Amino acid sequence: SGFRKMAFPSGKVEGCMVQVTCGTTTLNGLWLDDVVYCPRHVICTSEDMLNPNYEDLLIRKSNHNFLVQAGNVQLRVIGHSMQNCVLKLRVDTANPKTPKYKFVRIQPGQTFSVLACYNGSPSGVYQCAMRPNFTIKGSFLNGSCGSVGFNIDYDCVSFCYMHHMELPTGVHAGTDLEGNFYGPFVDRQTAQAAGTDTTITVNVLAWLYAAVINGDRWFLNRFTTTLNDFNLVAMKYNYEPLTQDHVDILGPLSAQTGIAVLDMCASLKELLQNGMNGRTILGSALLEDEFTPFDVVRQCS
Amino acid sequence: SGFRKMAFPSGKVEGCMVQVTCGTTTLNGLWLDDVVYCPRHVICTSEDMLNPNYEDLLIRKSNHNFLVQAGNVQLRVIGHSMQNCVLKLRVDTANPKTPKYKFVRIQPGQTFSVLACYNGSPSGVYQCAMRPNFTIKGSFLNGSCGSVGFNIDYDCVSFCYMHHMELPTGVHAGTDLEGNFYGPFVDRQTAQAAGTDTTITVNVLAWLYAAVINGDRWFLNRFTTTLNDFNLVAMKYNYEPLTQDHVDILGPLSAQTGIAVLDMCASLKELLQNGMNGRTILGSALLEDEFTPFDVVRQCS
Ligand SMILES: Cn1cnc(Cn2c(=O)nc(Nc3cc4cn(C)nc4cc3Cl)n(Cc3cc(F)c(F)cc3F)c2=O)n1
Ligand SMILES: Cn1cnc(Cn2c(=O)nc(Nc3cc4cn(C)nc4cc3Cl)n(Cc3cc(F)c(F)cc3F)c2=O)n1
C-alpha cells in the first residue's frame, strides 16, 4: 500500500553523464556508445548567449575546442556535428556502461524521471510530467543544462528529455534527444512565455483509482454522468477534454476497482464543484494530475 | 527554481541489492563487501511467520539453506549470524561495486531515499520522512521486504532503514541496518498499531522558506509571535513542539530570505487558524512536513 511520486532507479543513467566544456561555458552531457549528446548552447560564449547563430558558431569550432570529462577521465573528441538543438561529439572511447537505450519523444500528459545533474555529477532524481503546454515543472538550478529525463522498460532506458532552460515563471523547457524542442521555445537567453496550461484529466481519474485501491473512498458517490456532461463542467475548471480513448485506457483500473469510468467522473465533477472540504486524498489536498494510468498500475499492482 | 520531492541518485545502492531465499521464503538483501544483510524474517516458513522463535529457527539452519542470487550469479554462503532483527550472511565473494558506506540511525523528522526492490531487482526510488511515531508513509507491495533507505553525503552512502512490514493502516515499519526497529514494533506477522502521529513543525517552516525562495509569498504577514505563544496554538493542531534548537537550525534559511523565524511562525499560525483558502504553496494545498531544513538548502542553493 501507499502511493508516492516514484522515479525509476537512476543507476543506468548516472553511468552515462559527463561534463562538456567549450571555452568557459560548461554543462552536462550524455555519453552513449562513442557519442556525447549535449545542448548546443555550450558553444556560446556569454556574448553569444542572447542571440546566437549556431551554424556560424559551430563552423568556427574544431574538435579540440571541446573538453569532455567523464568524472576523472578526459574523453578525446574526434568529431562533432549538430542535430537541431543538440550537439553530438564523437569520442574515441565507447562508454563501457552504455545501457540498452532508445530516443523516444513523449506526449503531453506523460511522465518521466529526471536525473538532475551539475558539472557532470548527478545530484538528485525526481518524477514529473510533460505539461499540456509543453513545459515541465521541474527543480533545476544553474548548471543543470543537459540533465536528462527518461523512463525504463525492462532493462531499456528510453531517453525523452534533455533540459535546456528555465522560463520566467520558473518552469522548464527542453528538447527530445534528437534536439527538437517540446513546445514553442528556442535556445536563446531571452525571456520566453509559456502558454496557458490545463489540468490532465485522465491522470486525475487514474489517481482517484489509485486512491480507491489504497482505501481512500470518501469522495465516491452513487451518481453517474455522460461523457459530454462531464466535459462541459470540467472545462469550466481548465481541465482538458476526456476522450473515449481516455475512458478506454482507464479500463483496467475501472475493472480492478469495479467503478465505471463515468462513475468516477461523477466523483470528479463533485470534487470540482464542491472542493475537498478539509479532507485529503492520498495525502494531498488538491487533485493530482501527474500520475498516468500506467504509473498507477505500476505502483498499485 | 522549482521544488520537488527529490531522492538521491540510486545507482550506488542498486549495485548492492540481491535476492535471498530460505526454503520457499524470499526477500531482498544488501550486499556490502563479503556480507549480505537481510531481514531475519526470511528464515520463517509460512507456519513460523505468526509467532517465530528466531533463535530456534536459526540454529536449525546451515549455510547451504540460504540461496543468495546477485542477479544471475549465485553467491556461496560461507557463514551466518543474526544481529537483532537482521541476518548477516557471509559470502565467499566481496561485492566489487561496494560503495563507501556507513550504517546510521536517523531521528524522527529526518528524510531519506527509499529504493523499492522486488526479488532483488530495484523497481523505483522515492523520498520519505521518518514520522514522529516511527513509521514511514512508504509505497511498498508484497515482495518489498529488505528494501533499504539511505542518504548520500559526497560519495558515502549512509544506510538508515531496512524495510520489514506493512501495518494495518498501510504505513510501514522497519529497522536500522543493525537490526533495531524504529518504534515499538516486532518482526511477527501479527497486526500491530502505530501510535498517534504529529506534524513535523520545523519541516513545515523549512518548506515555507523554500516557498519564499521560489517566489511564493502570499502567506506572509507583518506580524510576529513568541515561541511559547506559537507552541500554544500549533499543538492544538497536533504539531510537535518548536524548540530553540529548531529556531537555530532554521537560522540560515531565515538569513537568506530576511524573514525571522518567529515571523515565519506568525505566518504558520494564521495558516493553521484560517486554512489556505483555495490557494497553494509550492504546488500543494496543505502544509508539507517531509522536507528538512537541509533538504531545502540542498534544493534551493
Ligand atoms: C535556474 N535554472 C534552472 N535551470 C537552469 C538551466 N540553465 C543552465 O544550467 N545554464 C544556462 N546558461 C548557462 C550559463 C553558463 C555559464 N557558464 C560558465 N556555463 C554556462 C552554461 C549555460 Cl548552459 N541557462 C540559460 C539558458 C540555457 C540554454 F540552453 C538556452 F538555450 C538559453 C538559456 F537562457 C539555463 O537555463 N537554470
Ligand atoms: C503490502 N506490503 C507492503 N510492504 C510489504 C513488505 N512485506 C513483504 O514484502 N513480505 C512479507 N511477508 C513475506 C511473505 C513471503 C512469501 N514468500 C514466498 N516469501 C515471503 C517473504 C515475506 Cl518477508 N511481509 C509481512 C511481514 C514481513 C516481516 F518481515 C515481518 F516481520 C512480519 C510480516 F508480517 C511484508 O510486510 N508488504
mmCIF file of N, CA and C in Angstrom, chain B residues 232-300:
data_model
loop_
_atom_site.group_PDB
_atom_site.id
_atom_site.type_symbol
_atom_site.label_atom_id
_atom_site.label_comp_id
_atom_site.label_asym_id
_atom_site.label_seq_id
_atom_site.Cartn_x
_atom_site.Cartn_y
_atom_site.Cartn_z
ATOM 1 N N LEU B 232 1.594 27.222 21.715
ATOM 2 C CA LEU B 232 0.271 27.023 22.304
ATOM 3 C C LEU B 232 -0.776 26.743 21.235
ATOM 4 N N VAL B 233 -0.676 27.422 20.089
ATOM 5 C CA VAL B 233 -1.643 27.236 19.011
ATOM 6 C C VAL B 233 -1.315 25.998 18.195
ATOM 7 N N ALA B 234 -0.058 25.867 17.780
ATOM 8 C CA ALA B 234 0.342 24.744 16.933
ATOM 9 C C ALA B 234 -0.033 23.387 17.531
ATOM 10 N N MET B 235 0.037 23.234 18.855
ATOM 11 C CA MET B 235 -0.193 21.932 19.493
ATOM 12 C C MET B 235 -1.671 21.595 19.601
ATOM 13 N N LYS B 236 -2.516 22.618 19.555
ATOM 14 C CA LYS B 236 -3.936 22.428 19.296
ATOM 15 C C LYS B 236 -4.170 21.762 17.947
ATOM 16 N N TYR B 237 -3.240 21.926 16.997
ATOM 17 C CA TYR B 237 -3.352 21.369 15.656
ATOM 18 C C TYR B 237 -2.482 20.126 15.465
ATOM 19 N N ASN B 238 -2.110 19.445 16.556
ATOM 20 C CA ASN B 238 -1.315 18.213 16.505
ATOM 21 C C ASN B 238 0.062 18.429 15.877
ATOM 22 N N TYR B 239 0.658 19.590 16.124
ATOM 23 C CA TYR B 239 2.010 19.912 15.694
ATOM 24 C C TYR B 239 2.984 19.661 16.837
ATOM 25 N N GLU B 240 4.202 19.270 16.483
ATOM 26 C CA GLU B 240 5.149 18.989 17.537
ATOM 27 C C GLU B 240 5.787 20.279 18.060
ATOM 28 N N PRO B 241 6.350 20.228 19.269
ATOM 29 C CA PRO B 241 6.966 21.432 19.841
ATOM 30 C C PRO B 241 8.094 21.983 18.987
ATOM 31 N N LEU B 242 8.154 23.310 18.926
ATOM 32 C CA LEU B 242 9.237 24.029 18.270
ATOM 33 C C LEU B 242 10.199 24.513 19.346
ATOM 34 N N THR B 243 11.395 23.939 19.359
ATOM 35 C CA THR B 243 12.415 24.273 20.336
ATOM 36 C C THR B 243 13.311 25.386 19.803
ATOM 37 N N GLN B 244 14.127 25.947 20.700
ATOM 38 C CA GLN B 244 15.101 26.942 20.268
ATOM 39 C C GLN B 244 16.142 26.332 19.342
ATOM 40 N N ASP B 245 16.433 25.038 19.498
ATOM 41 C CA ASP B 245 17.317 24.369 18.549
ATOM 42 C C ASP B 245 16.713 24.367 17.151
ATOM 43 N N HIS B 246 15.404 24.116 17.052
ATOM 44 C CA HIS B 246 14.716 24.212 15.766
ATOM 45 C C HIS B 246 14.825 25.621 15.191
ATOM 46 N N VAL B 247 14.601 26.640 16.027
ATOM 47 C CA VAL B 247 14.788 28.018 15.579
ATOM 48 C C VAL B 247 16.225 28.238 15.124
ATOM 49 N N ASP B 248 17.189 27.691 15.871
ATOM 50 C CA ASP B 248 18.594 27.826 15.497
ATOM 51 C C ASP B 248 18.882 27.164 14.153
ATOM 52 N N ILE B 249 18.364 25.949 13.943
ATOM 53 C CA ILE B 249 18.618 25.248 12.685
ATOM 54 C C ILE B 249 18.036 26.018 11.508
ATOM 55 N N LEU B 250 16.895 26.678 11.706
ATOM 56 C CA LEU B 250 16.287 27.481 10.649
ATOM 57 C C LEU B 250 17.022 28.795 10.401
ATOM 58 N N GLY B 251 18.107 29.059 11.127
ATOM 59 C CA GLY B 251 18.855 30.289 11.006
ATOM 60 C C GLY B 251 19.276 30.644 9.593
ATOM 61 N N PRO B 252 20.023 29.751 8.932
ATOM 62 C CA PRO B 252 20.483 30.063 7.566
ATOM 63 C C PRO B 252 19.359 30.398 6.597
ATOM 64 N N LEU B 253 18.243 29.666 6.647
ATOM 65 C CA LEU B 253 17.109 29.994 5.786
ATOM 66 C C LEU B 253 16.521 31.353 6.144
ATOM 67 N N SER B 254 16.430 31.657 7.440
ATOM 68 C CA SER B 254 15.959 32.972 7.856
ATOM 69 C C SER B 254 16.886 34.068 7.348
ATOM 70 N N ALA B 255 18.189 33.788 7.301
ATOM 71 C CA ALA B 255 19.148 34.785 6.838
ATOM 72 C C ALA B 255 19.049 34.989 5.333
ATOM 73 N N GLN B 256 18.962 33.895 4.572
ATOM 74 C CA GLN B 256 18.915 34.011 3.118
ATOM 75 C C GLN B 256 17.656 34.733 2.650
ATOM 76 N N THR B 257 16.545 34.583 3.373
ATOM 77 C CA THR B 257 15.287 35.209 2.987
ATOM 78 C C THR B 257 15.005 36.515 3.720
ATOM 79 N N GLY B 258 15.724 36.804 4.802
ATOM 80 C CA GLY B 258 15.444 38.001 5.568
ATOM 81 C C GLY B 258 14.153 37.964 6.348
ATOM 82 N N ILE B 259 13.628 36.775 6.635
ATOM 83 C CA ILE B 259 12.405 36.612 7.413
ATOM 84 C C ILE B 259 12.763 35.897 8.707
ATOM 85 N N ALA B 260 12.592 36.588 9.834
ATOM 86 C CA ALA B 260 12.873 35.987 11.129
ATOM 87 C C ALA B 260 12.020 34.743 11.334
ATOM 88 N N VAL B 261 12.558 33.795 12.103
ATOM 89 C CA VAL B 261 11.867 32.526 12.308
ATOM 90 C C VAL B 261 10.515 32.755 12.974
ATOM 91 N N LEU B 262 10.483 33.594 14.011
ATOM 92 C CA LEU B 262 9.209 33.857 14.671
ATOM 93 C C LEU B 262 8.272 34.696 13.810
ATOM 94 N N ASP B 263 8.794 35.382 12.787
ATOM 95 C CA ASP B 263 7.925 35.986 11.781
ATOM 96 C C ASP B 263 7.268 34.913 10.921
ATOM 97 N N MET B 264 8.062 33.943 10.455
ATOM 98 C CA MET B 264 7.508 32.816 9.711
ATOM 99 C C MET B 264 6.505 32.051 10.562
ATOM 100 N N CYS B 265 6.782 31.929 11.863
ATOM 101 C CA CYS B 265 5.855 31.262 12.769
ATOM 102 C C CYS B 265 4.510 31.974 12.818
ATOM 103 N N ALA B 266 4.510 33.305 12.707
ATOM 104 C CA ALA B 266 3.250 34.037 12.670
ATOM 105 C C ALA B 266 2.467 33.713 11.405
ATOM 106 N N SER B 267 3.168 33.498 10.290
ATOM 107 C CA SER B 267 2.508 33.046 9.071
ATOM 108 C C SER B 267 1.887 31.667 9.273
ATOM 109 N N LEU B 268 2.638 30.753 9.889
ATOM 110 C CA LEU B 268 2.141 29.396 10.082
ATOM 111 C C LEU B 268 0.929 29.379 11.009
ATOM 112 N N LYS B 269 0.957 30.192 12.070
ATOM 113 C CA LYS B 269 -0.198 30.296 12.958
ATOM 114 C C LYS B 269 -1.452 30.702 12.195
ATOM 115 N N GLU B 270 -1.333 31.679 11.292
ATOM 116 C CA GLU B 270 -2.500 32.115 10.533
ATOM 117 C C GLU B 270 -2.960 31.040 9.559
ATOM 118 N N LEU B 271 -2.015 30.361 8.901
ATOM 119 C CA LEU B 271 -2.386 29.274 8.002
ATOM 120 C C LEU B 271 -3.118 28.172 8.755
ATOM 121 N N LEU B 272 -2.666 27.862 9.970
ATOM 122 C CA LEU B 272 -3.345 26.855 10.779
ATOM 123 C C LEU B 272 -4.736 27.324 11.186
ATOM 124 N N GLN B 273 -4.856 28.586 11.607
ATOM 125 C CA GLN B 273 -6.124 29.104 12.108
ATOM 126 C C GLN B 273 -7.120 29.394 10.993
ATOM 127 N N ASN B 274 -6.645 29.820 9.822
ATOM 128 C CA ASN B 274 -7.526 30.261 8.752
ATOM 129 C C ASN B 274 -7.598 29.300 7.577
ATOM 130 N N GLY B 275 -6.715 28.314 7.503
ATOM 131 C CA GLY B 275 -6.648 27.488 6.321
ATOM 132 C C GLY B 275 -5.940 28.210 5.190
ATOM 133 N N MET B 276 -5.992 27.592 4.013
ATOM 134 C CA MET B 276 -5.245 28.087 2.871
ATOM 135 C C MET B 276 -6.135 28.742 1.822
ATOM 136 N N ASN B 277 -7.454 28.550 1.906
ATOM 137 C CA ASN B 277 -8.451 29.371 1.213
ATOM 138 C C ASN B 277 -8.263 29.342 -0.307
ATOM 139 N N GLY B 278 -8.367 28.138 -0.872
ATOM 140 C CA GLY B 278 -8.317 27.966 -2.314
ATOM 141 C C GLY B 278 -6.997 28.301 -2.973
ATOM 142 N N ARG B 279 -5.934 28.467 -2.194
ATOM 143 C CA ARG B 279 -4.607 28.820 -2.671
ATOM 144 C C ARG B 279 -3.635 27.679 -2.403
ATOM 145 N N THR B 280 -2.501 27.708 -3.097
ATOM 146 C CA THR B 280 -1.485 26.675 -2.974
ATOM 147 C C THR B 280 -0.138 27.284 -2.610
ATOM 148 N N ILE B 281 0.717 26.449 -2.026
ATOM 149 C CA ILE B 281 2.106 26.790 -1.746
ATOM 150 C C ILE B 281 2.977 25.712 -2.367
ATOM 151 N N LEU B 282 3.885 26.116 -3.257
ATOM 152 C CA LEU B 282 4.758 25.182 -3.971
ATOM 153 C C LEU B 282 3.967 23.992 -4.511
ATOM 154 N N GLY B 283 2.822 24.291 -5.125
ATOM 155 C CA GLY B 283 2.025 23.253 -5.750
ATOM 156 C C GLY B 283 1.233 22.359 -4.818
ATOM 157 N N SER B 284 1.202 22.645 -3.520
ATOM 158 C CA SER B 284 0.463 21.832 -2.569
ATOM 159 C C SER B 284 -0.612 22.666 -1.885
ATOM 160 N N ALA B 285 -1.732 22.014 -1.573
ATOM 161 C CA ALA B 285 -2.837 22.659 -0.880
ATOM 162 C C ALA B 285 -2.864 22.336 0.610
ATOM 163 N N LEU B 286 -1.817 21.703 1.133
ATOM 164 C CA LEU B 286 -1.662 21.509 2.566
ATOM 165 C C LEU B 286 -0.231 21.851 2.964
ATOM 166 N N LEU B 287 0.002 21.874 4.273
ATOM 167 C CA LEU B 287 1.305 22.236 4.818
ATOM 168 C C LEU B 287 2.198 20.999 4.803
ATOM 169 N N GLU B 288 3.223 21.023 3.952
ATOM 170 C CA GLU B 288 4.089 19.871 3.726
ATOM 171 C C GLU B 288 5.133 19.783 4.835
ATOM 172 N N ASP B 289 5.287 18.598 5.450
ATOM 173 C CA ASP B 289 6.222 18.463 6.567
ATOM 174 C C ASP B 289 7.300 17.399 6.345
ATOM 175 N N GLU B 290 7.540 16.953 5.108
ATOM 176 C CA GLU B 290 8.572 15.942 4.893
ATOM 177 C C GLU B 290 9.779 16.503 4.131
ATOM 178 N N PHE B 291 10.071 17.794 4.312
ATOM 179 C CA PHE B 291 11.299 18.425 3.833
ATOM 180 C C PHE B 291 12.046 19.028 5.016
ATOM 181 N N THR B 292 13.283 18.587 5.236
ATOM 182 C CA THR B 292 14.083 19.137 6.324
ATOM 183 C C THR B 292 14.718 20.460 5.905
ATOM 184 N N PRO B 293 15.177 21.261 6.870
ATOM 185 C CA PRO B 293 15.941 22.465 6.502
ATOM 186 C C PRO B 293 17.114 22.163 5.581
ATOM 187 N N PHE B 294 17.794 21.033 5.794
ATOM 188 C CA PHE B 294 18.890 20.653 4.910
ATOM 189 C C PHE B 294 18.381 20.331 3.511
ATOM 190 N N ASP B 295 17.253 19.615 3.412
ATOM 191 C CA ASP B 295 16.666 19.334 2.103
ATOM 192 C C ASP B 295 16.382 20.620 1.346
ATOM 193 N N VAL B 296 15.903 21.649 2.050
ATOM 194 C CA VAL B 296 15.576 22.909 1.385
ATOM 195 C C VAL B 296 16.843 23.587 0.875
ATOM 196 N N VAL B 297 17.875 23.672 1.720
ATOM 197 C CA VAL B 297 19.130 24.300 1.305
ATOM 198 C C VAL B 297 19.749 23.541 0.134
ATOM 199 N N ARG B 298 19.758 22.210 0.218
ATOM 200 C CA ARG B 298 20.154 21.348 -0.894
ATOM 201 C C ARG B 298 19.472 21.702 -2.210
ATOM 202 N N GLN B 299 18.163 21.894 -2.187
ATOM 203 C CA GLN B 299 17.434 22.064 -3.431
ATOM 204 C C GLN B 299 17.313 23.520 -3.859
ATOM 205 N N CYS B 300 17.458 24.468 -2.930
ATOM 206 C CA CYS B 300 17.266 25.890 -3.197
ATOM 207 C C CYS B 300 18.571 26.676 -3.118
#
